[PDB]
């Protein structure tokens, strides 16, 4: 309730698409009065409450109220939303630099102190988040975007916080949703969810980041489930065979299946592999 009503097409021009969902589509956009280009994620309103064919005003709303409240170099920002008849449109800070992998996937060879560089961004942004008890919950490889690609050192932005929930005391919180791939034992087998569930995923990203195979992957996606829940996984010699020993000691203490004994964001960058 109370998104601007005016046409953002008065506001704002729009330019290319950059990414589309089921049920979003983002697209470039330039703010007319300032010059500025942004980010458009226009988010389609399911409007009946039988249809499955769009977003509930519950979702979108609780996406809005969590983006609202943050400012940090290493998370996306909100600025502007518009409601129309079919649509919530978000106008977000612009991230023109594509997927992180992807930009890694250029260089021509990449050692694990500077995995690392990369990697501390995320956890400084998960940080950021945790601090303000903010669950992302789909922490995955294609939400870790790059600001600009074409600078020194580049900066990382976490983005889509359609999932992403305020840790409520009183209440716990089941629900089962984001990619088999990515998500913690807790998601898989609808038990009690929290901000651990982000430190198993950081933990699979980093997995990853250094070795470019997937921990828990099967051959369908009932077979990554179970993978997932049974903690199986390997640090296979084909893989890892340069991978130091305090490298794969963080991911063992991230990759746990009890949330209560998995390494916190707090504790992670403490750890000596990230603070030598
Ligand atoms: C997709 O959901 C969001 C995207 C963004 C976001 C903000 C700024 C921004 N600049 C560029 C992009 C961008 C560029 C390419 C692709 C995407 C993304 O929508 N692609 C799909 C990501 N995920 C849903 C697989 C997003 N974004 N995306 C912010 C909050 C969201 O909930």
Redesign the pocket.
């Known amino acids: 309730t109370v998104f601007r009503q005016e046409n953002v097409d008065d506001y704002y021009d729009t330019g290319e698409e950059?990414?589309?969902?089921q049920f979003?589509?983002?697209k470039?956009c330039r703010e007319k009065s300032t010059g500025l280009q942004?980010?458009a994620?226009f988010i389609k309103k399911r409007r009946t409450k039988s249809s499955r064919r769009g977003v509930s005003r519950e979702d979108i709303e609780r996406?809005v109220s969590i983006?609202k409240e943050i400012q940090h170099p290493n998370v996306?920002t909100?600025h502007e939303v518009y409601e129309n008849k079919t649509d919530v449109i978000?106008i977000?800070?612009?991230?023109?630099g594509?997927?992180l992998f992807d930009f890694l996937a250029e260089k021509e060879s990449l050692t694990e102190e500077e995995a690392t560089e990369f990697l501390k961004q995320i956890l400084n942004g998960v940080y950021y988040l945790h601090s303000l008890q903010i669950a992302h919950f789909?922490l995955?490889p294609?939400?870790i975007?790059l600001l600009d690609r074409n600078v020194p050192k580049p900066r990382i932005?976490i983005?889509?916080?359609?999932l992403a929930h305020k840790i409520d005391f009183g209440n716990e919180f089941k629900n089962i949703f984001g990619t088999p791939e990515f998500v913690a034992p807790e998601i898989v087998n609808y038990e009690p969810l929290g901000l651990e569930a982000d430190m198993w995923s950081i933990g699979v990203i980093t997995y990853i980041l250094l070795s470019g195979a997937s921990p828990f992957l099967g051959d369908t996606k009932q077979e990554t489930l179970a993978n997932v829940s049974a903690v199986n996984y390997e640090f296979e010699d084909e893989y890892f065979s340069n991978t130091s020993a305090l490298a794969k000691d963080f991911i063992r203490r991230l990759l746990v299946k009890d949330p209560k004994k998995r390494m916190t964001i707090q504790d992670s960058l403490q750890h000596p592999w990230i603070k030598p």
């Open positions: 950059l990414g589309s969902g979003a589509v983002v470039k942004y980010a994620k996406e983006l996306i909100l978000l977000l800070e612009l991230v023109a594509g997927e789909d995955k294609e939400n975007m932005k983005i889509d916080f359609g």
